[model samples]
Target: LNMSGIALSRLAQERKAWRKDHPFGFVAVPTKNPDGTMNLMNWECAIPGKKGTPWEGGLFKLRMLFKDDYPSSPPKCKFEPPLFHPNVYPSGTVCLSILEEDKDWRPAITIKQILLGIQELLNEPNIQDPAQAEAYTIYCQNRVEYEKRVRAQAKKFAPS
Candidate 1:
């Protein structure tokens, strides 16, 4: 059997598991690229912000890109419209360690773990990663103002 096919077949099992039992505010669905290419390796996921935080009630949309080397390498995840987080690049790419191919990534990592980690990341950005300079600087220099921006952004992304 082709190894690429093998990987997706396995992911398919996890896909169904996610469909049946996922955290209350998290959802993932297979989707096509703008050019109309679709496959199990690519997905669209939504993560709700943690309650009682500046990001509360916000529904963040992310795209998961699982290349053929998946299971051996971690997938790349990018937020839609590029969220204003210290760990998120201006292009909406996330900068978490878990998603880092050389860091905590492992074949055992599941979609659940990734989405959940993203949800947590929304509230607690990793200053060390520092993707976008503006958000990171404001967050470190002016705590209150940073929260204000975050809350405002959260409102704009509220699930409606």
Candidate 2:
């Protein structure tokens, strides 16, 4: 079987279990292509009013790619169109420990965990290794100004 098939099967099982655990948050589905590759479509959670962080009303899209040795290796994830954040690169690549091979990333971690981690990253940026140096500098030096910039960016890309 192809790697996509294996990943689809694994994701199917995980989706079922994730739905049971998190009635809210998000969900993702994988669409198989004629070329034997898979495209993942993720649904964003509805932003709560008067709650959550400044990024409350945002709907984000992510793309996932699974390798042949998926279970043994971590899949690749990147945001679509791109998002402005300290940890996220201009190319939409996320800079998280769990996504890096340098850190111990295990298949035991579910897709739900990854999505939740991304959501959390939106609120609390890892300034140590920032992709956007300007954003990181502003955030580190003047948090209030950084938050203001974030709010502006959020408004620009807020889900309708």
Candidate 3:
């Protein structure tokens, strides 16, 4: 009933418009805590693999935790379980420019924009801004090996 309304209001507005209509292979829904209270500030999303990438045929899980200053600040998104990727930290935190509070973040940026940005980042990791050593090293030096690892990881997440 206090500052919670500020951020919670934004999410409430979003839920009204969002009904699994974000493009094929992408869906986001609100989550809940153990006490049966809805966690509007935190959302869980399912990202399906891109058709032409190693991630194809897989379903990756991501969670976005909005800050009290969201829209002004940015939500932090992370993989449920650690995944190997150049742009994703070993701890599973996503490292993308749009999600960076110090970057082009603004209150106008919607949840769709954030998730879409993550979708693209999963396939295209910037080599210049490498966050993890092993992944960054492999992605930069060994193209073939990197694809193999990515495929295997994606396969593990595949429904079949």
Candidate 4:
């Protein structure tokens, strides 16, 4: 009856097939709005096998806005409440190659892959060229001080 019904059906089928093949990846089901648009909860990545990294206890929230041409064009991704990372702007916009039109993005890429990429970006920021130049400078000059700010900000947004 609705466009999302069709989309969800397809999503379920694909998820089932994917799970059958790969058992160690993450999957998130988008929550559907009354108007049929999909909304998803904040996605966080637990750094693999790391016990005491600066981001070990950090849980980041990512918000994605999919275009009408989704699956063909990558969705616009941002960190909600903003992030202090060099690749993440003060406005929350993320600078990832997959989100760039100049890069080699394709419809074949799945949401799981994108989320993983974002998690990786968190660990290794693109300091060479940053959207937030000030944050980049701080991070490049003094990583310890930059990380302290990041941890403080993460604490402010940590869910209760």
Candidate 5:
């Protein structure tokens, strides 16, 4: 099974630690199968935009996929519905260095830390790595429109 050895143990440990305590307004739970069985390799997560930012008041949903090599390799995180951001691909994949194995990713990085890193990326986008043309163009060409678009998106993802 994929859920074996260090991968499983690490995930289980992370789960327990997360359940005990995690950052405020963040949601990271393992996904369930059709039969109600939990799939530890797959997770459903939500990241709330930081306060005082254009992304504030929004809760973005993302799917996290982990392989048997997890802890050795970072999980892949993707927004369920693509977000309008310069560093987020049209497919919703993030372009953060920490999420890449060849970059800042390391075995010691925890799930909570990864989510917080992404949350921080929400407002501080790296223009050097433009993942999507639309958001990037608007961000550079019209600063006002870019923030307006972000605020508009926040309304769509408002907590219910």
Candidate 6:
């Protein structure tokens, strides 16, 4: 339980901004413990596929695990059950510049911004940084087949 005072305070305030206005079809909420106490260090979230893309119609579930040095450091985002994407590792952790502490992460970046950026990464994968080999190879060698797999996954995770 080495949660930083700064981390907790910032998360509490972030919750207010999130509840006030969040993107459509996106969800981000802190989890609760067994005793119903809020756990600011962990958040349960979902990001919808962008419209007109192969990933559309799906609602991807992910978890954001915050560290004691949050804001100073970035939260780790991992998809539940792993996602099939070139930029997403087999373990489901996302690979994006903004999520990296040394790269683009900053204290001013809001949680809402992170989710939105992931949504963009879904359709546009960064070829330079391939997180997974399967999707990346397929995407490069067989565009049609890759899109087919993406569409299938979208159907599997389609939102009601």
Best by lDDT: 6
Off by over 4 Å in 1: 32-38
Better of 1 and 4 by lDDT: 1
lDDT of 1 by residue, 33-144 (tens): 6777657788889888888999997889999988887878888899997999899999999999999878999888899998999888888989878999999999999989
Q: Give per-model TM-scores.
A: 0.93, 0.79, 0.93, 0.73, 0.95, 0.96
Instruction: Give the alpha carbon lDDT tens digit for every residue of 1-160 in model 3.
Output: 6666788888887777676456677878888889988888889997887989988877889998988876678889999886889988988898888888788687888888888888888888888787789999999899799999999989999876
Residue pairs with colliding backbones in model 5 are: none
RMSD of each: 1.9, 3.6, 1.5, 4.6, 1.5, 1.5
- The stretch of ten residues in a row with the least summed lDDT in candidate 1 is 31-40
TM-score, cand. 2 vs. native = 0.79
Give residue 104's lDDT in candidate 2 (0 to 100): 54
TM-score of 6: 0.96
lDDT of candidate 2 at residue 122, scale 0 to 100: 81
Question: Candidate 2 overall Cα lDDT vs. reference?
Answer: 0.68
Which candidate do you rate higher for TM-score, 5 or 6? Answer: 6
lDDT of 4 at 37: 66
Rank order (by lDDT, best first): 6, 5, 1, 3, 2, 4
Give the lowest summed-lDDT range of ten residues in model 4: 42-51
Better of 1 and 5 by lDDT: 5
In model 6, residue pairs whose N, Cα or C atoms come closer than 3 Å (at least 3 residues apart or on different chains), thus clashing, are none
TM-score, structure 3 vs. true: 0.93
Worst 10 residues of 6 by lDDT: 1-10
The 0-to-1 C-alpha lDDT of every candidate, in the order given, reads 0.88, 0.68, 0.84, 0.64, 0.92, 0.93
Q: What lDDT is obtained when candidate 1 is compared to the true structure?
A: 0.88
What TM-score does structure 1 among the candidates reach? 0.93
lDDT digits (tens) for residues 1-160 of candidate 2: 8876676677667767766686263656565567866444323322221225677655667766567666566767777757777888888777788887658578787777777777788888987788888778888998889878777766765667
